[PDB]
Structures are given as C-alpha cells and as structure tokens.
Amino acid sequence: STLKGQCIAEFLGTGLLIFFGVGCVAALKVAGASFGQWEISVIWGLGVAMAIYLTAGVSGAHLNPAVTIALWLFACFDKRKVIPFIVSQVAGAFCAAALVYGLYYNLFFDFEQTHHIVRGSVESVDLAGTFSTYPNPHINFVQAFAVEMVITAILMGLILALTDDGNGVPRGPLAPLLIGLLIAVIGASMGPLTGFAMNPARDFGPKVFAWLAGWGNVAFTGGRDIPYFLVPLFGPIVGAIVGAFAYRKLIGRHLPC
Amino acid sequence: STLKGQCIAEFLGTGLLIFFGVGCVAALKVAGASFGQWEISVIWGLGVAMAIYLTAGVSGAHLNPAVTIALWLFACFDKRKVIPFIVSQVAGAFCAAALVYGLYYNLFFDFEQTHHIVRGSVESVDLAGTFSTYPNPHINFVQAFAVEMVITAILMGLILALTDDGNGVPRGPLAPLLIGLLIAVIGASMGPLTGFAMNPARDFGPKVFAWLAGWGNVAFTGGRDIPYFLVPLFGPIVGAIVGAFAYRKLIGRHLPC
Amino acid sequence: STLKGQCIAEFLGTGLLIFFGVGCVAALKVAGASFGQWEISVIWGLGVAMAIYLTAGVSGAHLNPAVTIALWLFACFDKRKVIPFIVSQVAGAFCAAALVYGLYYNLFFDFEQTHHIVRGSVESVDLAGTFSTYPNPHINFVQAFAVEMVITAILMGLILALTDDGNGVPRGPLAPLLIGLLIAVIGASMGPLTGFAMNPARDFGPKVFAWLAGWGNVAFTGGRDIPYFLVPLFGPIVGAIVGAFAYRKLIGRHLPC
Amino acid sequence: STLKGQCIAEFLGTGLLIFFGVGCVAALKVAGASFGQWEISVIWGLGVAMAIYLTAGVSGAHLNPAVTIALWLFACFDKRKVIPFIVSQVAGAFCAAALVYGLYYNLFFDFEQTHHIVRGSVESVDLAGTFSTYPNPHINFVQAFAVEMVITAILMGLILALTDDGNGVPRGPLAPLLIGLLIAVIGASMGPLTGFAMNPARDFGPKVFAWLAGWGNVAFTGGRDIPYFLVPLFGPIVGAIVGAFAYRKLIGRHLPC
C-alpha cells in the first residue's frame, strides 16, 4: 500500500479506538451508566483490538506514536513514514473526540448545569477527564511518569514478540486479541493511577480538543503546578524505547532487516 | 439452499438474538437482576454471535434488514431475496418478543401493580423499553438519528471486511465472534444514548408487539412529539448504506460479482 | 475407551462443573462475595466448557442426562450406555455438592446463626438454593416448566449442530467454548426465572444432598404445593427431545448411523 | 535454551503475573476502584495467561513451584533445573511486589492515615492482604489447607492434559488461555475462602516483602495462632502432587520419557 492509504488507515484506526474508549467514559460520567474499573479497561482493550484488526493489513495497525517510534529504532520500520504516521494518529484521536462530544453534547451541558460546574476551572478537570487522562491526586509527576514508562514497556514487549516482520502487527485474529487483553489487564491494575494512557495520541489529541471546547489551560496542566500533559506525551515514548531495548537484549530475535 | 430454507434460518436467527437480548433486559427491569451497561451489551453481542454461527451456513446470517439492504446495493446479494429476508427478520423479532413476554408475564404485571403504572401512559414507556429502544431524555430526534447512522456504519464496515463472497457472513467461528465483540463495545459506549438498536427488525418487531400488548401509541412515539420509531427504522438503513459506500471507496476490495 | 473409563469421565466431568457453579453461588450467599447475574452465569458457562474439554476425548462430554437421552433417540448414541451414563452424571453432581458444602461448612452455619434460620423450614429454602435451583416466587409450575423446555431445546440444537458423529461433543477447543457461551447468555436472560438448570443431574444430585444435609422435604418441594423438583427433572428432558426433533426436521443433517 | 535464559524467563514471567494481580488488588483496596470477585479472578487468570504466552517458548512457562515440582516427579522435567526454577519464581514474585508497592506508595500511606491503621498490628493484616492471601475468618487451618490442595490438583490436571512433552506448557495461544480461564473460575468459586493462591511463589514472595515493608511477623502468621503462611507454601505442593498422580492413574497418557 502507498503512504496515502497507510496514513488513512492510521487516521481511521486511531479514531475508532478513541470513539469506543472516550464514548464509554462519557457514558459513565455524564450519562449515568454503571461501569467498573475492569469494565472500562476491557472496553478500551476490545476497542483497540477491533481497530488493529481493521488496519493491520494496510498500515500495520500501529495506532500509537510510541509504538511507531520504537519500531523505527528497534525494528525494520522506515524512518520516512514516522512523521506522517504520528500526525495521522494524532489527527484521528482529535477528530474522534469531537465526534463523541457532539453525540454527548446535550448530556455534557446538563451535567454542568446540575452541579454548577464552570468549564475551565479547577473543578472542571474532572469533567475534562472524559477525553484525556489525569493523575491520581495522591501521586506526583515523577510517580506518574514511572507508571507510564512501565506499562508501555510491557505493551511494547508483547508487540515485538508478535511481529513477524519489523513493520507492525501481523494479520490475523490472534495478535489483536492478545494486545487487547494486555491493555485490559494493564488498565485494571495500573489504570486508577494515571488512566493507563500508554498512547501519546490517545491523550494529546483529545487534550487539544478539550482546550478548544472551552476547558482552556486546565486541559493541559490538569490543575497541577507542573503541566501533567508531559507525562502521557513522553512517558509512553520512553517506556516503549526501554521495553523494545530489553526485548532486543534478553531475546534478540532475528528480523528481516 | 432454497429460498424457503433461507427464510426459515433468518426467522429463527433473528428470533434467537431477540430472545437473549430482550430477556436479559426483562431480567434487569422486572426481575430485579443486577446488570451493568457492559453486561447488557455483552449479552447482546454474544447472543448475536451465537445466532450468526447457527445460521451462516444456510442464509448467510444477515439477521438485519440494514445489512441485507446494504449487501444488495454494495455486494453480490440478489435483489429477489431482499423482501423475503426482511419480512422473515421482522417476523422473527416479533415472535421472540411475544415468547419473552409470555415467560415474564407474571413479573410484568407485578411490576405495574407495585408502582401503580398504567400501561399505555407516558410513564409506561420506561417499561416498554424492555422490548424496544428509546432515546435518552436529553437528546433530540436529529441527535438520535446521528447516533444510529454512525454505529451502523461501523458495523457494516466490519461485515464487508469479513465477507468472502457478497452474500453474507462466512462460515466459521472467527466472523461471528468479531461481530459480537463489536456490538458489545458499541453498546457500551453509545448504548446509553439510543439503546444501540443498529437493527430495524430488532426495534420495529418488538415495537409492534408492545403496541398489541396494551402499550398502544406510546410504543411507537415514545412520548415525543416526533415519533421516535423512525430513528431505528431508517437510521440503521442510512448508516449501513453510508458505511458500505465508505468501505467500497477507501478499500475497494474485489468481489466475485 | 471402555464403559468403565467412560463412566469415570462422566462422573468427574459432572462433578467439576458442579464444583465451580455451586461454589460460586455459595460465595455469593454465605461468603458475602459480590456477584452479578451475568457473572454467575458466565462462571457456570466457563465451568461447563472446562469440564467438556477435559472429558470430550473419553466419554464425549455429555455431563447432562437430557443430552444423553436426546443423543440416544436422535443420534448414534448406544442405548446400552444410557443408564450407566445417567447414574455417573447424577453421582458426580451429588459428590461435588458435598465437597463444596464441606469447604464452606463453617460459613454456612454462621449464616444461619446470624439470621436465626432454622434448617428445614420454609425460610431455609433460600439457603437451599445454593445447591439446586428454585423458581421465582411470581411464576407457577407450568410457567417454570416452559422455561426449562425452551432453554434446553436451544442448548440441544447447538450440540447437534456441533457433533461430527452421533456420540457427543467433538474434541477441540471450539465446541466447549461455544456451549459455554450459550449457557452464559441463557443464564443471563432466563436465569432469574428458574435458575437455568438445563440439567437433571445438576439439580437432582445436589437436591438429594441438601435433603440429607438437614433441609429435609423442602429441598425437593421448595415450599410449593406442587413439588418443584419435577420441573428440572423432566423439563430439560422434554426440552432436549423437542429441540433435537426440530433440528432433525429443519436441517436433517446426515449422521454415520 | 540454556539454564540462564530459562531462569530469566521464569523470573520475568512470575513477576509479570504478580504485577497484574497484586496491582489490581491494590487498586481495589487503597485506590477505591470498584472490583467484584469475578473481576478480580479474571484479572489473575488473564495475567497468568499473558505471562505463560510470553515465556512458554523459553522455559516452558511454569511460573509455579508446585507445577515445577509435580512435573519433575510425574513428567520428563529434569531434576537439575528444579531448584533454580523455584528460586527464580520466588525472586520474581518478590521483586514485582516491590514494584507495585512503589507505584502505590502514596496511596498506601494515605489509607493508613485515614483509618488510623498502625502497620504491623492485627488490624494491618487486612492491608497486608494486598500482596499475599489470608484465610476467611470463619475457616480453620485444616479447612484452608484442604481448599489449596483441591484447587491446585484441578489446575495440575489441566496442565498435564495440555503438555505435549513432559517439560511444561506448549507454545501457542490455546494452552495459556485455557489455564487462565481455569484460574478465573477457581478464584470465583473458591477465592473468598483462601485467596486462591495455588502458587507457593505468588504467596511466599510478596509475604517476605510485606515483612520487610514494615508489617513484621503478622505478614507470615496472619494473626492466627498457627502461622497461616504454611497453607499456601505446602498446600499447593501437596495438591499438585495429588492431582498429577490422579491423572497418571485415571488416564496414564504416554510421555517421551
């Protein structure tokens, strides 16, 4: 497939997983749906598994800038398609957040009117957590960064263990379901800490939309002195690089390139 | 298989998925069972997956008028079997709703007696939601129509990605489980909005039964000025056509016909 | 395999599914565990799937007198092994109920002491529901019988659709998981009605143990004028025969014998 | 693979399953996450399934001293690699418990400050249950020992039924998912009794860490006159040996050695 077709798949695949994940969080927050921590995590995992299955044949189903960067550095992914893949992934997450917000538009404004929440204030960060992840109030910036690095390193280890070539997830039903199951257990055990972002596009995209939607600066900072948005922007990237290096050293599986 | 055998499978397959889905909603409403949003959605997805597996060999396991119409327009489905398939699907959903109502007959009347609900009134629409879907009170007709179009377009995209021929779901365990998993995540994220109908037969059939059972006109209108029953009647049909067109343009996979 | 080895597998397989199913109900009742209707049903389905996988190679993994009888009448199952299979299935369920009761012995007596429940009275039927199924208070004997016939007919239809020969469930992972998934959705939608017994051994076995354990006559009658134990004893048997006949007429798939 | 590579896989595989399992229990206890008994058990099962899949090719994916000992006695596992496997498994569980504690460090101390819990006292055993298992207050030492023996015998029976050689779990997706599903149903039905340890390393490792972390002697004794830590240390070992012997007698499947 050409670069244009590969970029469209990454745009659509990332948007698909954001549509399911953010939509279910919106249902729990403003629609009054009853969702447990395991239920929320299994929706994210199954949504990513479905997005991977529908895009693996075309673009390799990266849907993650951290995965794209690590595959370039520790596999056979071409460097010329790194930047277009990341922009497509970020744009897909931004567009899907707008779509979810449009469908839940009336329920969002009803929630603020009931609880007298003024959008853009510190108390509005809880409602801003529908689109992006925010840390537990008891953890700090360094603790939040460590969580993102660890969970993304585990995720990148499974991806490297599943790839046949060095380009991305192989075709078939086995690989997407394994990745989706890993995301579900990660979000159940480490989710209450940092929102198990594991994806720079999954967080930065919806964060930009929330800033445009009226939340303003608290969408990026999250109400903390140190802007929290750096944790999901670089934590997964460092974690994926660390996890990919560990796999290449403890196993060192051969690759075509 | 002949047309008569294919129509029987569509009648039975659609009835099977309504039996599981409506029965579980009845358990949550009048039987006091504890069910979450994810639990309700996963029951609908697994019920459809089982119905597809038991009917794929005979009739292709459409079980959806929107899927049948879209396959006729954008695949190799014959036009002569479009009308008999739709009537069989609608009749199967109507008959299964009567069966569920018969088994829960005593629990239904006990619920109305306890809460002094008069069947056929505006307050009885909540009990009428056991059989068919009704919108969130905060959303409007246009918003409800947009939800149905989006979710059915995603569902039709997966079906077109799984079909080997242009007639319906292929035989095997992989395709029904993928469709069932997609229905579960759709109902978890967009379910609290419009009941994730995605199926004109799943809604119109039980709606006709509820009108006969004593709910009257509120079974179709739902208590709104604009009759809500048009949203699940045509929303999925438009969504499936839109989703099928997008797949044929962004991918354009070859078909035997 | 010889008859002796086949009977041991049916004894162990039926005991395995009772151990998981009754144990989880005991956890919900006397151990204070939080379990939903979908959670209870999925435990029964997965337990049966595991029991089928461990016994399919030896005895065909019947684990159900209704399935054994229907396979004799509408498939190639030998009539000489019908009686020993049923006795092995009933004995396995009885022995597994005693094992679960032994492990939960202290928690059972603590529950009665706290709530002043005298074993053998009408109020003790709720605690007797740990081992066997009892009807919803609002349904009658005829309504309860109809529920058991319908759900067992659906279960027998899937089994006949999966068998390669006419002896039982084939080897492999596909068939047990399909049966387990069907049991889970059946118990979620029709479970709150009659306990989704679907198995004469699953009910009669533990019912005999509960009578020996001190519950007495209310273990069989359930507090009703008509003894409720006839519903799970013959309802599944009639339902399996009806469901097997429907499959042989609407499909008529060829069999070796 | 050499012994050094096999020991690294057992260290990492055991740490991976402890990271998911203990982390989710920490989320339920100190992070306020909503988790049911089935949800907790399915996280343990899926975490073990993922750990088995990532280590089966190298070391056979034992991740259990009871499984390692039983495979040595009733299969073709070499005796020279029994001790290094057990030490690697115990060290992996100890290290993973420290990692989970580090990530939840602030939430742990906040919980004690709110409830005035002094670490090392009898009331602190409830918080010490995050890392290791402790019995139900109504059961005794003998009852707790019987639970561990029974559940580990069932687990060892499935493992022996899945092994092609006599070294460990075979490669592929089927075997790890079957083991993970069995662990989930075991933890749902027998979990509220003894914490469904089934693994000497899963319990002893985190128990040693909890003693170092400040809980002291109550980490091992659990507040009982007879130290409870002997139940998960030897109960699974006896259960695995008993279960392996039963499989070799009731089936007697041939092995290469």
Curated annotation (Swiss-Prot), chains A, B, C, D:
Membrane topology: Multi-pass membrane protein
Record localization: Cell inner membrane
Motif (NPA 1): 64-66
Catalysed reaction, written as an equation: glycerol(in) = glycerol(out)
Impact upon substituting residue 235 to S: In strain: HB101
Listed CDD domains: MIP
Bilayer-spanning residue ranges: 2-30, 36-56, 81-104, 140-165, 174-190, 228-250
Pfam family, one: MIP
Ligand binding (glycerol 2): 134
Intramembrane runs of residues: 60-63, 64-74, 195-198, 199-212
Disruption-associated phenotype: Mutant grows on glucose but not on glycerol. Disruption of the gene greatly reduces the level of uptake of both arsenite and antimonite.
Binding site for glycerol 1: 62-64, 199
Site positions per UniProt: Substrate discrimination: 44, 196, 202
Annotated function: Mediates glycerol diffusion across the cytoplasmic membrane via a pore-type mechanism. Is highly permeable to glycerol, but less well permeated by water. Does not transport ions. It may also have limited permeability to various other substrates, including xylitol, erythritol, D-arabitol, L-arabitol, ribitol, D-galactitol, D-mannitol, D-sorbitol, urea, glycine, D/L-glyceraldehyde and the trivalent inorganic forms of arsenic and antimony.
Other noteworthy facts: The remarkable property of effective water conductance combined with a strict exclusion of all ions including protons is mediated by two conserved asparagines which force a central water molecule to serve strictly as a hydrogen bond donor to its neighboring water molecules. Assisted by the electrostatic potential generated by two half-membrane spanning loops, this dictates opposite orientations of water molecules in the two halves of the channel, and thus prevents the formation of a 'proton wire', while permitting rapid water diffusion.
Subunit structure: Homotetramer. Exists in multiple oligomeric states. Is predominantly disassociated in the less dense fractions. Tetramers are stabilized while in the membrane and during affinity purification.
Name assigned to this protein: Glycerol uptake facilitator protein
